[PDB]
Design a protein around this ligand. Structure first.
Ligand code: CL
Ligand code: HG
Ligand code: HG
Ligand code: HG
Ligand code: HG
Ligand code: HG
Ligand code: MN
Length: 263
């Protein structure tokens, strides 16, 4: 089970004072939406460390994308799950091109040239795009059975504007009157079991579409959105977790820019 937390001194939560008055911090199915100010990282760090949590971070770097690995890994070392056990999984067609990045204690990297394995090596899997860089804290506050991240270009949009697959001939089809949020295909995760269930579902849905001669408007992301619509995530990450400052600047609603696209 889980052992007791130790004595800790921190500000008492205020029942009659809203966390944030500018954003939604909980979904209709009671999943928290992670924004700066909603969590006390010291409490969460304690909770996950007491469980000796290991987080796997997977990235695919093919062809010219291998050039993004150095910055990605170096910044992950400074901001991703610092203090916890981390196992990086770099899938690439150029294993010899992977840069030799210096890792902190308790962190390792495996190069897989281009599943069981994940179940016995890590507790959670975080799947992200490699042409990115960490700029601020990305920690255990995101860990949960299944999470999706709000696409920075649609967080304030109506479901009508969401670029979901709109053709009924596709397994990723989502009608104009359905949809909670538009999740990004570049940052999702959860327990190994839940992540594998999601990838398995999308892989099969994509095979059906292919056989039917159709390709979802935004490929994997379209299927990811259909999956999360029908299997509600247990946590939703705010756009703080995947932003593009060049394209979107730095709105007041974002107190931190944690993971961003590289110019
Ligand atoms: Cl991945
Ligand atoms: Hg708060
Ligand atoms: Hg993954
Ligand atoms: Hg899917
Ligand atoms: Hg897929
Ligand atoms: Hg997917
Ligand atoms: Mn990307």
């Amino acid at each position: 089970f889980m052992v007791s937390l130790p004595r800790m001194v921190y500000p008492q939560p205020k029942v009659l004072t809203p966390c944030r008055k500018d954003v939604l911090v909980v979904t209709p199915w009671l999943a928290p939406i992670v924004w700066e100010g909603t969590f006390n990282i010291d409490i969460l760090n304690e909770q996950f460390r007491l469980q000796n949590t290991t987080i796997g971070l997977t990235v695919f770097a093919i062809k010219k994308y291998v050039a993004f690995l150095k910055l990605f890994l170096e910044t992950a070392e400074k901001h991703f799950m610092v203090g916890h056990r981390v196992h990086y999984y770099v899938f690439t067609d150029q294993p010899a091109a992977v840069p030799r990045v210096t890792l902190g204690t308790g962190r390792q990297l495996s190069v897989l040239e281009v599943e069981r394995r994940f179940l016995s090596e890590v507790d959670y899997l975080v799947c992200v795009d490699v042409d990115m860089e960490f700029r601020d804290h990305v920690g255990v506050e995101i860990l949960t059975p299944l999470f999706g991240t709000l696409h920075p270009g649609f967080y304030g949009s109506s479901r009508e504007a969401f670029t979901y697959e709109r053709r009924p001939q596709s397994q990723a089809y989502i009608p104009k009157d359905e949809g909670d949020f538009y999740y990004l295909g570049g940052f999702f995760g959860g327990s190994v079991q839940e992540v594998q269930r999601l990838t398995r579902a999308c892989h099969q849905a994509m095979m059906v579409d292919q056989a039917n001669g159709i390709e979802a408007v935004w490929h994997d992301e379209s299927h990811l959105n259909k999956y999360l619509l029908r299997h509600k995530p247990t946590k939703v990450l705010s756009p703080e977790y995947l932003w593009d400052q060049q394209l979107l600047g730095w709105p007041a609603v974002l107190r931190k820019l944690r993971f961003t696209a590289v110019p």
